[PDB]
Design a protein around this ligand. Structure first.
Ligand code: CL
Ligand code: CL
Ligand code: NA
Ligand code: NI
Ligand code: NI
Lengths: 89, 90
């Protein structure tokens, strides 16, 4: 079974300085990322939205939407009824 | 300021299967947790009280009781006097 965080962690050392900044953010704040727009991430990291998109496409074919989808699989499931579902994105 | 739920949410993906079970319960039922013992949580989750204590110490140095103290800061405050608030109990 694939694991996007495993991939990013192990590819990380060969990324550019800017790619590393974005990747480290993803690895360190994977929960926060899934409910952020690319523009929001860019402002937080003092980079461009485009850069967030390009690194997303580098690590997964479907880019930013797919990165968030994939991340969400490794986040906590949410309670459906308080007497479970995939984490939101 | 620090936020223990923020920490657990963002560390969660790298935890072991058992740690994730415990952490998901804390994240999903944080109010329920503050008035449970580690043995009660263990029985709910079909795991060991020691594993609850270990996960607690992993996320906060004071362990299980400190976990509950920190959680209580993010729970509703309770009414001190009913006249026609205080830190949530632990
Ligand atoms: Cl690894
Ligand atoms: Cl978060
Ligand atoms: Na970071
Ligand atoms: Ni969440
Ligand atoms: Ni209460």
């Amino acid at each position: 079974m694939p694991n996007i965080l495993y991939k990013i962690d192990n590819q990380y050392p060969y990324f550019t300085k800017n790619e590393k900044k974005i990747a480290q953010f993803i690895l360190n704040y994977p929960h926060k990322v899934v409910n952020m727009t690319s523009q929001e991430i860019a402002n937080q990291l003092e980079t461009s939205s485009t850069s967030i998109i390009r690194l997303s496409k580098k690590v997964t074919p479907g880019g930013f939407n797919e990165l968030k989808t994939r991340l969400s699989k490794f986040l906590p499931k949410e309670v459906t009824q308080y007497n479970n579902k995939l984490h939101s994105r």
